[PDB]
Every structure is written in C-alpha cells, then in structure tokens.
C-alpha cells in the first residue's frame, strides 16, 4: 500500500544516489520528492 511505496521511493533513491545514478532517474525523482501522497 502507499506506505510500503513511500519507504520504496527513499529507498530506491538510496540505490539511485550510490549507483543507479543516471539523470533519467532524477525525472521520477523530481516527481518523488513532492508530496505526491
């Protein structure tokens, strides 16, 4: 449910910032940090 899915995009931003750091992910990421709850 969104909680589990609040905790999955910290996380995989986590993955993003250490290694999955390509620009494409700072799209959904732009779109992550917003309260789009």
Same mark, same amino acid.
């Given at each position: 449910?969104?909680? =589990?899915?609040?905790?999955? $995009?910290?996380?995989?931003?986590? =993955? ?10 700072? *799209?959904? =990421? *732009?779109?992550? *940090?917003? $309260? *789009?709850?």
């Amino acid at each position: 449910v969104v909680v =589990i899915l609040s905790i999955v $995009g910290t996380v995989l931003s986590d =993955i993003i910032q250490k290694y999955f750091f390509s620009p494409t992910l700072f *799209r959904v =990421i *732009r779109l992550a *940090r917003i $309260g *789009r709850i």
